[PDB]
């Protein structure tokens, strides 16, 4: 299953504050931070060459043409909080959040070790990196709007 318009379920993205160039604590219980935004739902695009440390597989990978096609990885989220125990917290994508037009959210399997179902935010059509990043930024903003709508009932 893939979702295309609105999410039907609350999804959570682990936030490791160390990964960001600036403070992202603001995003754990956010205010009006849909007006620049931290790249919270950006997937890794590479594996850096760190000697001694085995290569990290990129979350998503482009074709030789530079285009990121569907089902070739994406950004990981789960259907409950705290799945990653060593994170600083979870950025919340509430049920009912608008999915940017060229992205989709794929339900993958239930993971027994983590006791949570994994999901992948991915491109719905082939796109260059910049376009994908752009949509993922709008996805963050939609999620924040939707947090406040939910709070006002």
């Amino acid at each position: 299953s893939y979702d295309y318009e609105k999410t039907s379920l609350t999804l959570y993205r682990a936030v490791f504050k160390a990964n960001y160039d600036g403070d992202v604590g603001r995003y754990l219980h956010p205010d009006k931070e849909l007006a620049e935004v931290a790249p919270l739902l950006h997937p890794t695009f590479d594996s850096p060459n760190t000697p001694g440390v085995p290569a990290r597989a990129p979350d998503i990978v482009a074709g030789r043409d530079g285009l990121y096609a569907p089902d070739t990885g994406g950004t990981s989220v789960f259907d409950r909080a705290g799945v990653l125990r060593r994170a600083d917290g979870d950025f919340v994508i509430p049920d009912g959040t608008d999915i940017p037009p060229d992205l989709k959210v794929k339900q993958d399997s239930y993971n027994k070790r983590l006791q949570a179902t994994h999901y992948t935010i991915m491109p719905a059509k082939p796109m260059y990196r910049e376009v994908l990043m752009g949509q993922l930024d709008n996805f963050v903003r939609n999620a924040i709007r939707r947090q406040w709508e939910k709070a006002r009932g």
């Binding site: 682990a14 490791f16 440390v53 990290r56 990885g73 990981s76 060593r86 070790r113």
Partner: protein, 75 residues
């Protein structure tokens, strides 16, 4: 290319076994880059799932293969 089905069996077993080993370290040995390792194991699980769908497909094309659930059994 399609990997041979024996190759899928091996990869499934090794992935399962490194995942148990590194999950046990993560929880019992307080390793130096715990946070990076925890994320690595998410990546291992996603790969495990992709190997599993491929092996379900191989199960329909070959005979004599062990069922998936036997391959990832804890020994």
């Amino acid at each position: 290319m399609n990997l041979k089905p024996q190759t899928l069996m091996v990869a499934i077993q090794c992935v399962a076994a490194r995942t148990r080993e590194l999950d046990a370290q993560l929880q019992n040995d307080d390793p130096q880059n715990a946070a990076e390792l925890e994320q690595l194991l998410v990546g291992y699980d996603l790969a495990a799932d992709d190997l599993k769908n491929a092996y379900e497909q191989a199960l329909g094309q070959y005979s004599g293969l062990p069922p998936y659930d036997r391959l990832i059994e804890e020994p």
